[PDB]
Design a binder for this molecule. Structure first.
Ligand SMILES: NC(=O)C1=CN([C@@H]2O[C@H](COP(=O)(O)OP(=O)(O)OC[C@H]3O[C@@H](n4cnc5c(N)ncnc54)[C@H](O)[C@@H]3O)[C@@H](O)[C@H]2O)C=CC1
Ligand SMILES: NC(=O)C1=CN([C@@H]2O[C@H](COP(=O)(O)OP(=O)(O)OC[C@H]3O[C@@H](n4cnc5c(N)ncnc54)[C@H](O)[C@@H]3O)[C@@H](O)[C@H]2O)C=CC1
Ligand SMILES: NC(=O)C1=CN([C@@H]2O[C@H](COP(=O)(O)OP(=O)(O)OC[C@H]3O[C@@H](n4cnc5c(N)ncnc54)[C@H](O)[C@@H]3O)[C@@H](O)[C@H]2O)C=CC1
Ligand SMILES: NC(=O)C1=CN([C@@H]2O[C@H](COP(=O)(O)OP(=O)(O)OC[C@H]3O[C@@H](n4cnc5c(N)ncnc54)[C@H](O)[C@@H]3O)[C@@H](O)[C@H]2O)C=CC1
Ligand SMILES: CC(=O)N[C@H]1[C@@H](OP(=O)(O)OP(=O)(O)OC[C@H]2O[C@@H](n3ccc(=O)[nH]c3=O)[C@H](O)[C@@H]2O)O[C@H](C(=O)O)[C@@H](O)[C@@H]1O
Ligand SMILES: CC(=O)N[C@H]1[C@@H](OP(=O)(O)OP(=O)(O)OC[C@H]2O[C@@H](n3ccc(=O)[nH]c3=O)[C@H](O)[C@@H]2O)O[C@H](C(=O)O)[C@@H](O)[C@@H]1O
Ligand SMILES: CC(=O)N[C@H]1[C@@H](OP(=O)(O)OP(=O)(O)OC[C@H]2O[C@@H](n3ccc(=O)[nH]c3=O)[C@H](O)[C@@H]2O)O[C@H](C(=O)O)[C@@H](O)[C@@H]1O
Ligand SMILES: CC(=O)N[C@H]1[C@@H](OP(=O)(O)OP(=O)(O)OC[C@H]2O[C@@H](n3ccc(=O)[nH]c3=O)[C@H](O)[C@@H]2O)O[C@H](C(=O)O)[C@@H](O)[C@@H]1O
Ligand SMILES: [Cl-]
Ligand SMILES: [Cl-]
Ligand SMILES: [Cl-]
Ligand SMILES: [Cl-]
Ligand code: NA
Ligand code: NA
Ligand code: NA
Ligand code: NA
Lengths: 345, 345, 345, 345
């Protein structure tokens, strides 16, 4: 990271590639931030999807990324393509001189994640990874409790993601449900919960995982469980399935330590259900209210970074922390063995 | 198992060894069943504990098991001694011609469990193992739902035992907190929940476990997590700690299958919290009411068995199913490897 | 094996324990051989099954094996009980001074098989294991071709047992479908085909196996496949399932060597389907006709042995050859690893 | 994959490198499709083989691939060279701006297969892999039955390739019978049957393999067997030998599921021998008739793709599915261990 000069007297310019489902949320976010930011170029290999985006946003349209990169003077290129394409696209963006914002997960394979970080490092350009859930109110209070050491020593952690994805979800596009482009219940659907393991609880020492495809016609897991050991000695598990009858049931985390016990549950870690500490704290009166956000807030940090006003909340190197866990869980489930971190020396 | 003749025209006679804490619950149970059963002999190596039992129950007292066995004409000898003594005591009882009822867990080491079953087999006498929680109302409804196949294919299971045991609990006696005589959070405190894994969900294929002593001054685990794979493909985890702040928090099970989702929680699997099936069933109207029992009910089955009126709900061979899981979890945690079942060919 | 004196001037005396399904075939066999042999004592722990046997055969009845052994002057005690009981019963017979004929498989666990052989050795009494299929006409021609070296070097072997067993088969009795008493598709249903691996092809070096319970509600496998390597370098596989739609389809073996190719198929290795050798042989004209037997013939060898006229076709030591393969296949499937022979040094 | 523009108003142009045995079948195929396609350039490092091709086809001749690539304006470059050369040649073609059609197998080493896909991806050009057997009538009906779910849950699969290749087959050229350029019984001779494992039955979880050179003077296997486990739980084996006495005997597949049992056999999966489903289907009346094709049909799809009329039936990414199985079988046979998929995270 060299010092990069702030961008001062114009809006920040965005280009976007992959005009599908979540691109809608990025369009909305950018619309909100229209005084500080504009979307000037969009790219999709499917003419209709590209048509809809160009008509909605007013941006110029392009049929390939390589062409858009030859033309755009965007500051940042946003990757909202299938997950397994993020690495090659990010590296091409970096090598052409652009900051990159990649949707999660940043890669589907470990060396691809590493290579996208190395390319951004060498270009002296930012790589932002979208982890928009971290700023949720419940997850912020948890993070604050952790930063203050309210739990003392952590002993036990349980994360559950009991959700529902029918066959028609995976059949919506060829990329979905594939190792190369998607990953399964852990790498795609529950990835914002995998993220909590290192971000809230701290460095992981090792994992032991089982995964399976118990019902869907896909090659990735629809169901999995992982035993986790933290370098602090804390132990825990994360359990996920997309096969829950008959709709989404639970997105929860329970954290138990020496001097505190918390559970945040609901369908999406959205309800503080248990909140008990050995000593009270100012933050405790926000607890009913804790129970925009998402992409719009994420974009405020990216904009501030470009203006010299802040630093990335989640850069490529931060993204590697949860990717390395996902890849250790996948190796452990594949080979039936404990896999320890870090993956590389 | 040869046919044994029913006992018809007298009360069933019990002797008991180990006049400590849970012996209180056996005394109460036997007092309840006083028309069908009597306690005629009690044994403890500690004079005071033995004194209290003899004065409460009226039974004759003995200072060693070997002496009591030379004297008593009990039908059944009840073992309420430290866990690691059950095997040698059971085998001595069997070899002297008595049916044995052992408190859980039946043994602390795998070959010791096997040997107590082999000795009872060779004597053609019963070995009952006390699993008094199975007849709890919540756990009975769950079992019934399982027997009816209400879930269809099971996908995902989570068991949590988040309880509290302070140092003074373990320091109460030398045997407690030791591998040889006790075992830890899984083998002692949460053993009635380990029991659910095979009894409710079915045959286990393998486990992967971590355990640790994170706070107590004992050699066994105070905290653990186990990843479980069932032969049906179902996956799950069980998470336990005795370090919960500041008192018992949760004893729960969640079961997710193709056509059903259930959670029974509370501090002791005592509250049906989620109960959703694809088709209704008669058993569904008992659900508020589900939310004596324990030892007294256990004793009714043991009495009925002795009278020819039933068969054991939980004999030594049934007890080996959860013991084999505990021993696989302990081997897996010790060696950091997946351990698959059955343990012996 | 000491020299045992022939039995000359009376019929050979049999006792039988376990008056169930295959005991019918032993009764028939003994009825056939009524001039050389008689059944004088029968034993079953179920009063009705014992009643039926006593009324059919005229033998005296007993309610326990231990009693029958105290009374009978049988030469041989026949074990037609659940498989997992054969070892303890055989050892008791041997230790009481009787020759034993055990139904297959001889044991369900390796050390139990070893112990029954050791006990018969120490008693200087025979242990016969029932492998009645070996004398089938098709299997005899195959064996003869092997003994003559008609194939030259063996290269490739495939055995398929594609059969059908519905849930009601396993539910018929508690012992069925259990590791301890039965074993699964390999150890029970297809055991006469496992037998061919060492008996026809020769010493096995190692196996690699997968097994699963894909549909039945039992703890043993309903489906399996094993990769086999012979010490000669020959390779092969055996594939079994009890889940075949909608009835028994195939019991076959294919053997390929340097100078010969054979397939014997049908539902039960009963049809010579392919029979091609580099040089013709006298045995080749029996080939249409090859395409009593069973228990009656087995009994002729047992009778002849007792009369000094022959030696056992299949004694306990011969039975250990296929048991050791089954146990290596079970260990390999359980642990996901190649298992090499012999099991013990 | 960018959108590539269709080729409309001329024939598609082909160039071919490696004017040996199977190039004959490509010449024939191209002759058939002479109104839509022409072969304009041929390449061989052996002057005579090149002479014969140029005189047969009328194409211009070249002595090196690098020269032909500098000259030809072919749309597609066809690789009919030794297998181990396909990757370097494909990558050179891609980097020079050509679509590539490679003969099977696409590579002999895993990273080489990956690299040829990566190079075609980066060039935005097609990589077709020749799997001409998939459109065989028998294999199409099987595929259709699979797509319709006629079997319900699959339980058991057996593939046998019992064929004959004498020493003179391998001695025909230096490349044959070598790991680097050929592979053995699985990667070369039976590769169209390995292909069925993922294409018909679905994603594979793991394999366990033995291979050997039992008779031929080559370094690759002439004989092998593989135990296979599918992610669905289905199990099976594939058995291959090139040592069959005295000529090709069997190319078969047997598939057993919940509600269907099929066997397609003959010398080359060319005879529907067993075809039994729980419910009839329109496709069932084609069954006698099922019992051009090959390269000519393959070429119709390649031509249609170039004309915008279809997409590849088998592109490089599709080719990686069977290559990854072959490489897992080779690693498993080499190291004597179960090898699980996918190979890369
Ligand atoms: N942050 C979050 O919470 C979420 C993130 N995502 C991530 O967003 C990405 C997109 O997911 P969706 O929008 O759901 O998928 P989608 O299938 O709806 O979007 C696919 C878009 O990319 C286009 N495309 C494919 N290849 C391309 C190429 N080479 N060049 C240009 N465009 C190409 C497709 O034509 C399509 O319009 C994935 O990485 C996913 O993990 C998705 C949902 C939630
Ligand atoms: N079913 C359930 O839910 C429960 C079962 N238990 C089981 O009951 C057993 C007893 O636990 P506690 O009553 O809590 O322990 P305790 O320490 O209160 O009881 C110990 C008794 O055994 C006596 N003793 C020790 N060695 C002896 C010997 N060689 N001969 C005769 N007496 C001897 C001690 O003097 C003492 O009175 C353990 O196996 C435990 O796992 C305990 C609590 C709950
Ligand atoms: N050679 C072959 O081809 C076959 C061999 N078998 C073998 O025969 C044995 C019996 O199988 P089935 O006759 O099918 O089973 P079964 O369940 O029909 O026979 C069970 C008999 O043993 C009795 N029994 C159980 N425990 C006993 C005890 N402790 N003492 C005395 N009797 C006892 C039961 O009451 C019952 O009558 C098994 O080992 C089986 O593997 C069975 C079928 C085929
Ligand atoms: N799809 C199918 O069913 C079949 C596919 N094949 C595949 O086709 C390929 C060729 O096999 P064959 O035609 O049987 O072999 P071959 O040995 O008959 O053909 C070899 C040709 O390539 C030439 N050659 C070697 N190195 C070269 C180079 N650097 N540049 C140019 N030419 C070179 C040789 O001189 C020779 O004419 C192999 O990959 C094989 O696996 C072969 C038979 C069947
Ligand atoms: C914040 C967060 O955790 N986000 C994750 C989350 O996103 P998002 O909230 O947008 O999903 P959304 O709830 O709309 O359901 C999506 C489909 O589910 C099906 N769906 C959903 C719920 C249900 O009960 N049943 C059901 O069929 C139905 O088909 C829906 O169309 O799911 C994304 C995904 O899976 O691709 C993950 O990638 C994200 O990490
Ligand atoms: C049915 C069931 O699951 N039984 C298990 C259960 O039994 P039982 O219910 O009798 O325990 P009980 O709740 O009385 O607390 C015991 C001590 O805990 C301490 N204790 C308890 C709760 C708490 O909040 N804090 C605390 O210190 C306090 O010191 C208590 O004296 O705990 C047993 C044990 O541990 O030996 C297990 O062996 C049993 O399997
Ligand atoms: C010689 C040989 O290989 N013997 C083996 C064989 O014996 P035996 O031939 O006597 O079986 P038998 O064919 O009568 O079917 C038995 C039941 O199958 C069910 N059965 C059978 C066939 C079928 O199509 N469908 C079916 O339901 C039906 O319920 C039948 O009642 O099966 C025995 C068994 O399994 O215990 C194995 O232990 C033996 O090794
Ligand atoms: C469709 C299919 O499965 N194709 C595979 C198949 O191709 P193709 O059908 O063209 O073989 P072909 O039957 O002509 O015999 C070839 C030689 O075998 C010898 N051969 C053959 C049969 C026999 O009985 N004896 C014999 O010596 C004789 O020397 C023959 O010259 O064999 C190819 C090969 O091996 O290189 C595999 O690469 C292909 O995957
Ligand atoms: Cl919740
Ligand atoms: Cl709760
Ligand atoms: Cl057949
Ligand atoms: Cl055939
Ligand atoms: Na898995
Ligand atoms: Na531990
Ligand atoms: Na298995
Ligand atoms: Na090999």
């Amino acid at each position: 990271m060299i010092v990069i000069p702030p961008i001062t007297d114009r809006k920040i310019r965005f280009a976007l590639v992959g005009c599908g489902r979540i691109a809608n949320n990025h369009f909305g976010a950018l619309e909100k931030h229209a005084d500080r930011a504009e979307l000037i170029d969009v790219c999709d290999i499917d003419p209709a999807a590209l048509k809809a985006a160009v008509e909605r946003t007013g941006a110029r349209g392009h049929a390939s990324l390589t062409d858009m990169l030859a033309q755009t003077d965007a500051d940042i290129v946003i990757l909202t393509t299938p997950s397994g394409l993020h690495p090659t696209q990010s590296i091409e963006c970096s090598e052409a001189g652009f900051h990159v914002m990649t949707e999660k997960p940043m890669a589907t394979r470990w060396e691809d994640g590493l290579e996208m970080v190395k390319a951004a490092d060498k270009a002296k350009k930012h790589l932002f990874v979208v982890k928009q859930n971290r700023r949720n109110a419940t997850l912020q209070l948890l993070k604050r409790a952790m930063q203050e050491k309210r739990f003392g020593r952590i002993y036990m952690v349980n994360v559950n993601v009991f959700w529902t994805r029918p066959q028609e979800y995976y059949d919506a596009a060829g990329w979905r449900g594939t190792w190369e482009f998607d990953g399964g219940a852990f790498m795609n659907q529950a990835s914002h919960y995998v993220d909590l393991l290192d971000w809230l609880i701290g460095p992981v020492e090792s994992v032991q995982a089982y995964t399976a495809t118990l019902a869907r016609n896909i090659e990735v897991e629809d169901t999995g469980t992982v035993s986790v050991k933290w370098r602090s000695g804390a132990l825990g598990s994360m359990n996920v399935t997309m096969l829950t009858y008959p709709k989404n049931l639970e997105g929860s985390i329970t954290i138990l330590g020496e001097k505190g016990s918390v559970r945040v549950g609901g369908v999406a870690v959205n309800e503080i259900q248990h909140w008990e500490f050995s000593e009270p704290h100012a933050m405790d009166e926000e607890i009913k209210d804790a129970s925009g956000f998402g992409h719009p807030l994420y974009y405020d940090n990216v904009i501030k970074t470009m203006r010299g006003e802040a630093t990335p909340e989640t850069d490529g190197r931060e993204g590697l922390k949860s990717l390395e866990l996902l890849i250790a869980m996948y190796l452990s489930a594949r080979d039936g063995r404990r896999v320890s971190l870090p993956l590389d020396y």
